[PDB]
Design a protein around this ligand. Sequence first.
Ligand SMILES: Cc1cc2nc3c(=O)[nH]c(=O)nc-3n(C[C@H](O)[C@H](O)[C@H](O)COP(=O)(O)OP(=O)(O)OC[C@H]3O[C@@H](n4cnc5c(N)ncnc54)[C@H](O)[C@@H]3O)c2cc1C
Ligand code: NI
Length: 384
Amino acid sequence: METRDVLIVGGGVIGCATAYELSQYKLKVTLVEKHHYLAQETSHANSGVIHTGIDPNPHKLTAKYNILGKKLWLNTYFKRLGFPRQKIRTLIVAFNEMEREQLEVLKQRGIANQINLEDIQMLSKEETLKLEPYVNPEIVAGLKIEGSWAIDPVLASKCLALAAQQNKVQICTNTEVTNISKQVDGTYLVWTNNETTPSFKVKKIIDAAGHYADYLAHLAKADDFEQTTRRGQYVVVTNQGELHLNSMVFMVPTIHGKGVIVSPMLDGNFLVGPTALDGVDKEATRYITKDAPCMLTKIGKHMVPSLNINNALISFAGSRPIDKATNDFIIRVAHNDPDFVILGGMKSPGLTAAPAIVREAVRLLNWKLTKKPNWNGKYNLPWI
Ligand SMILES: Cc1cc2nc3c(=O)[nH]c(=O)nc-3n(C[C@H](O)[C@H](O)[C@H](O)COP(=O)(O)OP(=O)(O)OC[C@H]3O[C@@H](n4cnc5c(N)ncnc54)[C@H](O)[C@@H]3O)c2cc1C
Ligand code: NI
């Protein structure tokens, strides 16, 4: 049985960035992940986009943490951590007059979420097709936003963890939390992999368990929020000849769901998707099906008609964990246990928001913390 200050449960990007942030303090920290490797779940199956903030409702935590999160990635995390990424602008395209006025709404949203005017540009049909000659010519309008990036979220999550690990954070994989009990004395005992006796005794739990973030709070008797799901399947295609894109192209999200794209990927291939299906089981959140490819053909070709979807390399899927009550991020202490911090409902744009989400996690522990004087935070993930 390890006694420790903080147990972080879940090794997606939220758990990993949390470990990184806490590694700068004098603390005994452990992170637990049920899989043999980190970032195998939602943080594996997403489009990797660092969103501008044009999209999320400005009154929600999604917008708030998008804004903070992105600044942190660009002006702090990218200076210290090496992993693949690239700067690439956002283009949202409209197909009729109703989608066209949605662009005007989106513009306003971006401004409300503090995007400078110089980054936003409404484009006519003609201007859009000049910028991106391979887009559907039946579009009527476009909205271009500079400032977005695309990263490999897997390599980023691992970089964060390795960085944390280098600064004395304990990372335990193949370790699934199966029971938690708060003690008379204020600490938790934690059982893993259904073992008989506890593996950990800790003062604080940071719940970053993705689709099981709700399960884990119910298990600690700490909060009773519930998540639902939205599963999205993608395809990656290659060998598209003369095809080029210098933007990530999006359908209007307001009409077609969040993050429906055709994007050029870091590896030179094109990502298409995703589909959308609500209410799949938690254990099914990454299952691919034979239904989805057909929807994917319609989505890709509507946006980039010269796309050949038979030139397909992989199919994969992921699901957004969605808080049932608020349809927003959950970033707070449990309502019924001030020592259990919840980072749940980590839907889009949780990746973009991550750094801000986890700094708030650190504050919600409500401790006077002492910095290690010899921390700088730098890690270059070797990759080629
Ligand atoms: C299709 C799709 C597209 C998206 N696109 C973007 C995008 O372009 N940009 C953006 O900003 N956001 C995007 N998002 C949102 C983003 O991917 C998620 O916000 C983020 O990955 C959530 O990370 P997480 O760490 O909370 O969850 P996860 O990555 O799911 O990790 C949670 C971890 O907890 C572990 N776990 C669960 N239960 C236990 C247990 N009891 N014990 C131990 N471990 C446990 C799991 O194994 C796991 O890996 C997208 C999401 C989806 C689904
Ligand atoms: Ni407002």
